[PDB]
């Protein structure tokens, strides 16, 4: 471990040390092209539901964006059902989503049906996204989630911050073919998935970063050259400096890169590679500070739209 911290440290303010690069095969297609008129969440199992009328309440003077709605402690305020947990918000797409409480040791399985995804020409019509809380900074130790009926918008997750702990969620995904059989990669054609939009405002005074970590068995993170997202001493992958408000050595601001489709969107991306079932964690870290604003709700989108074509081997 001490030698990986040293590898991280030398690489912090550099681009790739080498020219070595291997093409990423895009065998797995899980992107906007796979959403159909029939795509939807068919069920959510394992989690208590949050009534939309509880989820939509904010405090006087608050903005009503989805992140602000997310940053409240709903432990013990999750008495909804699948019907009344349905929420509309433009960030969820035109078909909306569902509010759910995530709790320690209670994985929540979100099933999508009606897909037209593929892997080497095998049609993927259904998927299970399993979310499991791993870290929460709220008093109740819970997280709130809104799961979108668009699997490419995926999830918004957050809670109130009372201490310095990370927000962290494990996501394990199963893809199914039309016959109902799980689709797993062939030996020489791993799954590739994007880890995008990992913004960071981290400074010595404070701020926070969105990260990925804890890549599961047969999964690995791969660096994109010129990306600010790279492995840190704590084992997580994020930008250790501010690319959001312009105070960092690069002077970059969120509007300079953090948009889907931006030429600079790779600034906050990596690539996930899986020779097996996809599984990894995502979250938010203040590196331990408790009074950091807007540092406990995030949007995590899942797709195969990589912001690169090759990676370091």
Distance CA 313, CA 311 (A): 6
Distance CA 170, CA 105 (A): 11
- Distances in Å between the alpha carbon of 206 and those of 66, 72, 168, 239, 254? 23, 21, 19, 13, 17
Which value in Å is the resolution of this experimental model? 1.6
Give the number of C-alpha atoms closer than 13 A to the C-alpha of residue 180, restricted to the C-beta side: 0
Distance CA 302, CA 196 (A): 9
> 124: closest CA among 135, 133, 111, 113?
113
Domain tally for the chain?
Answer: 1
Q: Which domain holds residue 190?
A: 1-313
Structure determination technique employed: X-ray
């Amino acid at each position: 471990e001490p030698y990986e911290k040293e590898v991280a440290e030398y690489n912090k303010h550099k681009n790739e040390n080498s020219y070595v690069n291997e093409a990423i095969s895009k065998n797995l297609v899980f992107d906007q092209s796979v959403v159909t008129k029939d795509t939807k969440i068919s069920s959510i199992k394992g989690g208590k539901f949050i009534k939309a009328t509880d989820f939509n309440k904010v405090n006087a003077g608050d903005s009503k964006d989805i992140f602000t709605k997310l940053r409240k402690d709903m432990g013990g305020k999750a008495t909804g059902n699948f019907q009344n947990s349905f929420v509309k918000e433009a960030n969820l797409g035109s078909n909306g989503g569902y509010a759910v409480l995530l709790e320690k040791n209670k994985p929540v399985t979100v099933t999508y049906t009606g897909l037209n995804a593929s892997y080497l020409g095998r049609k993927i019509t259904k998927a299970e996204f399993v979310y499991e809380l791993q870290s929460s900074p709220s008093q109740s130790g819970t997280l709130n989630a809104v799961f979108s009926n668009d699997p490419i918008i995926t999830a918004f997750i957050g809670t109130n911050r009372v201490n310095g702990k990370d927000v962290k969620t494990r996501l394990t995904i199963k893809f199914f073919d039309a016959s109902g059989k799980e689709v797993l990669p062939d030996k020489d054609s791993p799954f590739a998935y994007a880890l995008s939009s990992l913004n960071s405002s981290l400074t010595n005074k404070g701020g926070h970063a969105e990260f990925v970590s804890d890549f599961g068995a047969n999964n690995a993170f791969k660096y994109i050259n010129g990306s600010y997202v790279k492995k840190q001493a704590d084992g997580k992958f994020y930008s250790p400096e501010d690319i959001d408000y312009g105070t960092g050595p690069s002077g970059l601001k969120n509007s300079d890169w953090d948009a889907v489709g931006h030429k600079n969107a790779y600034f906050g991306s990596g690539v996930g590679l899986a020779n097996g079932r996809i599984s990894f964690s995502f979250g938010m870290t203040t590196k331990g500070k408790s009074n950091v604003p807007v540092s406990s709700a995030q949007w995590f989108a899942f797709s195969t739209n990589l912001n690169a074509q090759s990676v370091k081997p």
